[PDB]
């Protein structure tokens, strides 16, 4: 039996809005530790891994390790029927063919109960090694979304170059080219408004702006985004879900 209760229901709402367009189907792995999801998109160029720790839920219970095959389009439909201040509880039986999502309003006068069919999946799951990377930039999530959105109008691919001082994004298309250059914030007040760069080696990498713009749908989960780069290997885009976990997006590079 699995039972998890979340007073900040909007969190799960955001999570599925962050996922549903990139991935149609995913496996949800339930344990005593919490919820983990990992999935490649249909083209296999990108990868998502979600982690929600059991200490983040108001109450959490897991008897058996559980693997639920879920249509993400469907889970999103269900969660769009929740208000942002609903208390959301997830629940499954030991032999559950469905997952139960129960939404509670703050007046005890409205309660919604939804029941989702699970599905058989034949997934392709990956081994994600812990490396250390040559470059880590941390910046406003909103700034990053803006950049990816704007430059996508210029050309298909963005070139990201890390230096000690700051970071540069560049794209090219039929019309010409653009360079957006962010320096390290020199006078630092608030964490999330700042641009901070920590680097061992200069990185220069090329990515598809198409995919990044899926990623930036996660922007409402956090004020900040962290970008992790190493030469010729997938980029990692990380959003912290505060004091509960994270969504990490990986992106296969162009050469």
């Amino acid at each position: 039996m699995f039972e998890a209760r979340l007073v900040q229901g909007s969190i799960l709402k955001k999570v599925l809005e962050a996922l549903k367009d990139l991935i149609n189907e995913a496996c949800w792995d339930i344990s005593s530790s919490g919820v983990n999801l990992q999935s490649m998109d249909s083209s296999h160029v990108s990868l998502v891994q979600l982690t929600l720790r059991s200490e983040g839920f108001d109450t959490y219970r897991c008897d058996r390790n559980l693997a639920m095959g879920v249509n993400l389009t469907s889970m999103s439909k269900i969660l769009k029927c929740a208000g942002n201040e609903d208390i959301i509880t997830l629940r499954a039986e030991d032999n559950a063919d469905t997952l139960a999502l129960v939404f509670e309003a703050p007046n005890q006068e409205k309660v919604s109960d939804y029941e989702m069919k699970l599905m058989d999946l034949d997934v392709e799951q990956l081994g994600i090694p812990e490396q250390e990377y040559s470059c880590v930039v941390k910046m406003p999530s909103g700034e990053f979304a803006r950049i990816c959105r704007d430059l996508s109008h210029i050309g298909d691919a963005v070139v990201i170059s890390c230096a000690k001082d700051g970071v540069k994004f560049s794209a090219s298309g039929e019309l010409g080219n653009g360079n957006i250059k962010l320096s390290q914030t020199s006078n630092v007040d608030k964490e999330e408004e700042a641009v901070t760069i920590e680097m061992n080696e200069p990185v220069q990498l090329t990515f598809a702006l198409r995919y990044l713009n899926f990623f930036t749908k996660a922007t409402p989960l956090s004020s900040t985004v962290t970008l992790i780069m190493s030469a010729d290997v997938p980029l990692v885009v990380e959003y912290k879900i505060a004091d509960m976990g994270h969504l990490k997006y990986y992106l296969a590079p162009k050469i």
């Binding site: 496996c27 693997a67 639920m68 599905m119 997934v123 990956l126 296969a252 050469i255």
Partner: peptide
Amino acid sequence: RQTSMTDFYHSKRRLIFS
């Protein structure tokens, strides 16, 4: 040329039954 994630990481297949 655009690489895929399997160019970097090993791939186990998995069967979920629901």
